[PDB]
Design a protein around this nucleic acid. Structure first.
Ligand SMILES: [Mg+2]
Ligand SMILES: [Mg+2]
Ligand SMILES: [Mg+2]
Ligand SMILES: [Mg+2]
Ligand SMILES: [Mg+2]
Ligand SMILES: [Mg+2]
Ligand SMILES: [Mg+2]
Ligand SMILES: [Mg+2]
Ligand SMILES: [Mg+2]
Ligand SMILES: [Mg+2]
Ligand SMILES: [Mg+2]
Ligand SMILES: [Mg+2]
Ligand SMILES: [Mg+2]
Ligand SMILES: [Mg+2]
Ligand SMILES: [Mg+2]
Ligand SMILES: [Mg+2]
Ligand SMILES: [Mg+2]
Ligand SMILES: [Mg+2]
Ligand SMILES: [Mg+2]
Ligand SMILES: [Mg+2]
Ligand SMILES: [Mg+2]
Ligand SMILES: [Mg+2]
Ligand SMILES: [Mg+2]
Ligand SMILES: [Mg+2]
Ligand SMILES: [Mg+2]
Lengths: 30, 151, 100, 262, 205
RNA sequence: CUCUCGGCCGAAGCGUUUACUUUGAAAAAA
RNA sequence: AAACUGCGAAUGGCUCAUUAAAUCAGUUAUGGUUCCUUUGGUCGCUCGUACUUGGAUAACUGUGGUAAUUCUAGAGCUAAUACAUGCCGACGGGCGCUGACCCCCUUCGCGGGGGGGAUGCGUGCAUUUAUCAGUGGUGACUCUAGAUAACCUCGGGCCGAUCGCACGCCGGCGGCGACGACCCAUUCGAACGUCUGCCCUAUCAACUUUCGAUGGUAGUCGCCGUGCCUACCAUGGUGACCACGGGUGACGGGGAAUCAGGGUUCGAUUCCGGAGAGGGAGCCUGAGAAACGGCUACCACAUCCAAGGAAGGCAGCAGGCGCGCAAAUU
C-alpha cells in the first residue's frame, strides 16, 4: 500500500508541477 | 552601548555568532546578523529593532513572543521600571437606573521594548496581548504615537 | 529452618524487622502480612519482629534435612502432587523430551 | 469536578434533538467520536425518536447488536455513536439509506437517499500538514486523515470520499459562486451561493451567502460547508431545498395545505 | 506539598488574597535535582498524563558540540567553573542549565587531527608515538593529499581555544536541563562568549 | 475617498480617533 | 463457582460552611500545556528456541495464631494479554562519510581535471543538543518538512512470543474478526490566562516591600506561560475614578415576586459553573483525585475489648437524637 500510494502521488505531483510551470511560463511571457 | 551588563551573556538565541571566518574576510567585524520578525496585523517593524544591538527576549520584534488576541490602547503614565511601563485606560461605565455614565480607569503594566525610544509621559501606546511575561504583565507595546503637542 | 510464627496476640512475624516485640509499619502491595483491598492502598499494621523469644503462640518450622528416625505422622506418608505441569516447556523438561 | 463527565441532563441536551421533558432526567450522552457532542445525532435518538423503529432504549440495543446499522459503510454497535453532518446510515435488512443533512430549521432531517448515492460522502477539510518524510496529510471534519491528497486541495475545500475505499475522488474549491450549506449558528441549515468573504486577520472571517430566492445572510467561515460547484449540489437536498420561509409564508403554506386536504 | 499556585501570592495592589480552595494536585512542585558530578545516577519521575521525567542526580558524561567545526562528541564533564545565578552552585559543583563547565578535549582533538591532518594541542617535545605519526602524516594518493592540503588552508583555530587544547580542557555551556531530561548536553564556548566568560571567571577569583 | 495590483469592477490603504445611531455575526436548555 | 488479569470506582447523589475582582457571566487565548477512551492515519521505512523462551503466585489441598476485623502466617501444587526474557524475516541493498587501489583526460611532462572503487564507521520514527539551507502553512513561529555531527537514561521507547470463528487453495501461502501498541490527528474535556461587570461600610486614608511587594537577568520546579521558587540587581506596584481594612442573615449565574413608565426585593432549592465531605495537613494508585462510601497523621468526638489491642466519618437513600416557629416511609 505504501509503495502504490507513493507512486500514484509522484505521478500526480509531476502533473501538478507541470501545470504550475506552464502557468509561470504564461506569466513570464506577459 | 555595551549590552553585557548581567552575570550571564546576552545573545539572540537564533543567531549563531561563532561562524568560522578566514583572515581574508576579516574586515573589522562581521557585523553580527540581527534576528527580527514581522509581527502581523499591519504593524511595521521599527528600524531601531532591525538595526539595533539590544538584547530583549520579551521584545515583540526580536524576542520570543507571539502577539495574539486583544489589541488595546492607553496613555503612558509611569516609566519607572526596567523595560516595562504603566499605562492608563479610561472609559465610561453605564448605569441603567440613572441612564448615565461614570468615569472609570484601570492601570496596566505593559512591556516596552528598547526599540521605542523617546517615550514620554503622555503619549499613546497601542499594546497587544501576549503570553504572561511576569506576574502582572500580559501585554507588549506594539506602537507609540506622540502626544498632541509634542516638539 | 525457622519459617515464621505468630505472637501471643496473633500478630504475624515479619522477616526484616530486627526486634523482639511489635512495631507498626506502613505496608504496601508486595509486602507480607498485608493484602491490599484496592489498587495503590497502603495500611498501617502491627507486626511482630523477626527474633524468636518466649512470647509466641506458634512457631512455624520447616524440616530442611531428615535424620535417621521417622516422625510418626510427619515423614512416612506422601502427597500425590496433584495438578501436574501445564506449560508445554515444563512438560518437556519433566519428561526429558526432545523437540520431536 | 475531577475527571471527565459521563452523564447528560435531558434539559441540557442539544435542542435540535427535540427531546421532551417528562420522559426522564437524562439524555443519551453521545459517545466520543468523529463529531462534536453538540453537533451530532446519537444513534439511539435517530433509531428510536426519529424513525420509530424502536420504542425503548433496550429495543435500540437489540437492533444494533444484530449488526444491522452501518454508519459510512461500517457496522456500528454503539447505540450512543455520534453520527453527524453528511454521514450515511445504511440499513440493509430493510434496505434504506439516509444522509444526515440539516433541515432549514437546524435539525437533522430524515432524508432518504438512493443506494447509488450512499457510496460516497462530502467532507470539509480542516487542515493540511506535512509529516513523516514529506508526506502531505489532510484532516476532515469527520476526523479522518488522508495521506497523499491532491496538491490543489486547500483548507476550507470540500472533498468527495468513496466510503468503500476512503480515498478522494474529486473536490470543490472554496470560492465565490459555489453552493454551500450553513452548519452552525443562526442560519444553520440554509443553502445558498457564496457571494463574498471578508477577511479579518487575527479574528473570524465572515462569509456572505445568497439564497435561491434572493435572500442574503452572513455566517462565520467555520460555519460554511461547500456542497456543490456552482449552482448544482453534489448531493441530494432535503424536501425543503435549503430556503427558509418566514413564519408568515409558512403559515400561509400550512393553511393552503389544510384547505386542499379533503 | 510543594505548591506552584498563584493564589497564595499578594494581589498587584498589595492586598491579601483569601484562598477559595485547598491545594490541588495539578499545582504541585517537587524537590530540586541538584545534579552533581559523579558516576551516573538517574531517577525517573511519573508526571502528569502518565509520562516520565528523568531526574539526574549524578552525571559525568555529556554530549557537547563544537559549533564552528560542527563536531559533536560525547565527552567527560570535569568541573563547574561558573554559574550566573548563584555562587553556591559553583561551590557545590551543581550541573544546571547555562552553567559553565570544563569538558575533556580529547575527542575534539582526535577529530581535528583526523580531519585536517594538522597537530592540535601538542607540546614541543614532538614525541608523536606511532598510530599518531600515521594519523598526522601517513601516505596518501595525490588526490587525497590534495584534498587534505585544500583543507589545511582554512584550518586555523582561535588562540583561546588553542590554549585550552594545550591544557586539555575546554570551556562549555550546558544547554540542557539535567533535572528534567537526565542529560548534560551543550556547546563548546568560543568567540565573544568565551571572552566574556573568561573575563567573568578571572574577576570572580 | 483616491493612487496602485488582478479579472467597469474585485483589491490596497486611511479619512485623526471615537462616542452615538442602524445593520450583521456570535451568543445553552429550562 | 472461585481466584489471577483487565476496566470502572475521579461519574452520579448531597449540601452551601468557606469564598468580595475571588467565584461566576458574556467575550477571547493557548503561536504556552495535558488528555483513558471513541474515530482515522501509522505499525516489513531501522542493514543489526522462533514450529514458541524463564521464574513465580493465586484459586485448590493441608497445618495454624489471636477475645476480636473484609486480620492473616507457614507448607504442597499449577496458569497468563499478570511478571519478565528474546529472536528470525523484509535483507538485496541504498545512503552519508572513509579511500587501499584502478581507469580516462588533458597537459612533453609536471601538474591540473573527471570517473570507478575494496576495506572500515554511521543509518528509521520518538529523545537531547548544536549546525546548515529554504515541501506546505499562518496576520504573525524560533511552525511543518528537509540536510548534517552526535546523543539516546538499567528507576530502559516503538519496532505483536496473545485470543476466537470459518476453513481453504498450492511442497508454502491465506479470509474475517478480538485484544495490544510508540507517535500524529479527532472527540470528551481539564488547566491556566485577556477584556468588561459585584452588596454594605471612612467611627477603615493610605497600603505592599526586612519573611516577594513591583520589574530585570540566569536558573529550579512544574504538563507548560509566570516571583511559581532561588541568587543577584533596580525601587518599584495600588489609591478619594474609594486602594487597603472590616462586615454580610454573601456560593455566583440562568432566573423568582411585585410592577403604568422607571424601579424595589428575593435567588440554600432539581439546569450551568464553584467548593466541601467533623477540622486542618500529607499522600498512593491512576489518563484523570491532593478522592475521604481510598490511605497516613495530629485536633475534637466516639465504638468493641479478655486492657494486650482493633475499628471509625449519612452535607448519599430511609431512619433516630438534638435544635428549633419550621419540614415525609428504616
Ligand atoms: Mg460530582
Ligand atoms: Mg486566531
Ligand atoms: Mg501519555
Ligand atoms: Mg435562554
Ligand atoms: Mg478483580
Ligand atoms: Mg474502557
Ligand atoms: Mg479507574
Ligand atoms: Mg487507533
Ligand atoms: Mg506457597
Ligand atoms: Mg525564566
Ligand atoms: Mg524574573
Ligand atoms: Mg529572593
Ligand atoms: Mg455563608
Ligand atoms: Mg445574591
Ligand atoms: Mg441557592
Ligand atoms: Mg444558610
Ligand atoms: Mg449543582
Ligand atoms: Mg473534593
Ligand atoms: Mg456532620
Ligand atoms: Mg481529603
Ligand atoms: Mg458517607
Ligand atoms: Mg464520593
Ligand atoms: Mg439521611
Ligand atoms: Mg421540639
Ligand atoms: Mg411546613
Amino acid at each position: 500500500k505504501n509503495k502504490e500510494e507513493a507512486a500514484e502521488y509522484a505521478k500526480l505531483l509531476a502533473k501538478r508541477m507541470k501545470e504550475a510551470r506552464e502557468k509561470r511560463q504564461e506569466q513570464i511571457a506577459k | 552601548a555595551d549590552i553585557q551588563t548581567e552575570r550571564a551573556y546576552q545573545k539572540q538565541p537564533t543567531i549563531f555568532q561563532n561562524k568560522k571566518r578566514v583572515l581574508l574576510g576579516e574586515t573589522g567585524k562581521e557585523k553580527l546578523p540581527r534576528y527580527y520578525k514581522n509581527i502581523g496585523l499591519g504593524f511595521k517593524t521599527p528600524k531601531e529593532a532591525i538595526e539595533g544591538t539590544y538584547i530583549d527576549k520579551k521584545c515583540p520584534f526580536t524576542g520570543n513572543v507571539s502577539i495574539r488576541g486583544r489589541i488595546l490602547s492607553g496613555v503612558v503614565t509611569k516609566m519607572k521600571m526596567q523595560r516595562t511601563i504603566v499605562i492608563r485606560r479610561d472609559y465610561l461605565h453605564y448605569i441603567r437606573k440613572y441612564n448615565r455614565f461614570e468615569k472609570r480607569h484601570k492601570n496596566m503594566s505593559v512591556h516596552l521594548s528598547p526599540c521605542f525610544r523617546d517615550v514620554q509621559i503622555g503619549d499613546i501606546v497601542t499594546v497587544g496581548e501576549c503570553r504572561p511575561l511576569s506576574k502582572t504583565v500580559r501585554f507588549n507595546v506594539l506602537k507609540v504615537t506622540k502626544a498632541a503637542g509634542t516638539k | 529452618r525457622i519459617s515464621g510464627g505468630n505472637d501471643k496476640q496473633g500478630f504475624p512475624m515479619k522477616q526484616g524487622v530486627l526486634t523482639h516485640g511489635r512495631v507498626r509499619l506502613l505496608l504496601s502491595k508486595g509486602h507480607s502480612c498485608y493484602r491490599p483491598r484496592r489498587t495503590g492502598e497502603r495500611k498501617r499494621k502491627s507486626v511482630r519482629g523477626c527474633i524468636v523469644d518466649a512470647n509466641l503462640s506458634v512457631l512455624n518450622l520447616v524440616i530442611v534435612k531428615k535424620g535417621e528416625k521417622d516422625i510418626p505422622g510427619l515423614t512416612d506418608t506422601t502427597v500425590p502432587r496433584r495438578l501436574g505441569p501445564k506449560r508445554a516447556s515444563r512438560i518437556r523438561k519433566l519428561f526429558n523430551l526432545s523437540k520431536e | 469536578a475531577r475527571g471527565p463527565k459521563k452523564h447528560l441532563k435531558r434539559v441540557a441536551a442539544p435542542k435540535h434533538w427535540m427531546l421532551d421533558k417528562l420522559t426522564g432526567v437524562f439524555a443519551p450522552r453521545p459517545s466520543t467520536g468523529p463529531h462534536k457532542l453538540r453537533e451530532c445525532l446519537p444513534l439511539i435518538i435517530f433509531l428510536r425518536n426519529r424513525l420509530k423503529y424502536a420504542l425503548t432504549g433496550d429495543e435500540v440495543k437489540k437492533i444494533c447488536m444484530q449488526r444491522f446499522i452501518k454508519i459510512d459503510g461500517k457496522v456500528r454497535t454503539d447505540i450512543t455513536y455520534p453520527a453527524g453532518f453528511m454521514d450515511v446510515i445504511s440499513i440493509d435488512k430493510t434496505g434504506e439509506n439516509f444522509r444526515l443533512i440539516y433541515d432549514t430549521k437546524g435539525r437533522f432531517a430524515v432524508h432518504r437517499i438512493t443506494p447509488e448515492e450512499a457510496k460516497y460522502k462530502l467532507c470539509k477539510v480542516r487542515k493540511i500538514f506535512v509529516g513523516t518524510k514529506g508526506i502531505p496529510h489532510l484532516v476532515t471534519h469527520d476526523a479522518r486523515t488522508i495521506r497523499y491528497p491532491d496538491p490543489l486541495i486547500k483548507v476550507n475545500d470540500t472533498i468527495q470520499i468513496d466510503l468503500e475505499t476512503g480515498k478522494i475522488t474529486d473536490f470543490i474549491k472554496f470560492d465565490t459562486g459555489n453552493l454551500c450549506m450553513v452548519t452552525g449558528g443562526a442560519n444553520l441549515g440554509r443553502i445558498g451561493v457564496i457571494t463574498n468573504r471578508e477577511r479579518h486577520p487575527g479574528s473570524f472571517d465572515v462569509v456572505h451567502v445568497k439564497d435561491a430566492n434572493g435572500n442574503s445572510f452572513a455566517t462565520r467561515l467555520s460555519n460554511i460547508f461547500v456542497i456543490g460547484k456552482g449552482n448544482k449540489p453534489w448531493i441530494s437536498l432535503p424536501r425543503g431545498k435549503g430556503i427558509r420561509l418566514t413564519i408568515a409564508e409558512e403559515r400561509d403554506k400550512r393553511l393552503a395545505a389544510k384547505q386542499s386536504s379533503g | 506539598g510543594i505548591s506552584r499556585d498563584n493564589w497564595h501570592k499578594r494581589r498587584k495592589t498589595g492586598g491579601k488574597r483569601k484562598p477559595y480552595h485547598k491545594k490541588r494536585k495539578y499545582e504541585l512542585g517537587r524537590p530540586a535535582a541538584n545534579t552533581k558530578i559523579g558516576p551516573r545516577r538517574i531517577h525517573t519521575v511519573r508526571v502528569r498524563g502518565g509520562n516520565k521525567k528523568y531526574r539526574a542526580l549524578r552525571l559525568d558524561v555529556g554530549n557537547f558540540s563544537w559549533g564552528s567545526e560542527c563536531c559533536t562528541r560525547k565527552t567527560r564533564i570535569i568541573d563547574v567553573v561558573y554559574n550566573a545565578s548563584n555562587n553556591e552552585l559553583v561551590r557545590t559543583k551543581t550541573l544546571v542549565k547555562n552553567c559553565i563547565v570544563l569538558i575533556d578535549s580529547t575527542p575534539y582533538r582526535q577529530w581535528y587531527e583526523s580531519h585536517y591532518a594538522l597537530p592540535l594541542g601538542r607540546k614541543k617535545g614532538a614525541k608523536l608515538t606511532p598510530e599518531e605519526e600515521e594519523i598526522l602524516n601517513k601516505k596518501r594518493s595525490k588526490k587525497i593529499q590534495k584534498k587534505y592540503d585544500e583543507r589545511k588552508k582554512n584550518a586555523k583555530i582561535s588562540s583561546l581555544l588553542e590554549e585550552q587544547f594545550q591544557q586539555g580542557k575546554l570551556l562549555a555551556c550546558i544547554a540542557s536541563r539535567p533535572g528534567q531530561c537526565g542529560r548534560a548536553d551543550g556547546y563548546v564556548l568560543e568567540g565573544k562568549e568565551l571572552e566574556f566568560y573568561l573575563r567573568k571567571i578571572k574577576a570572580r577569583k
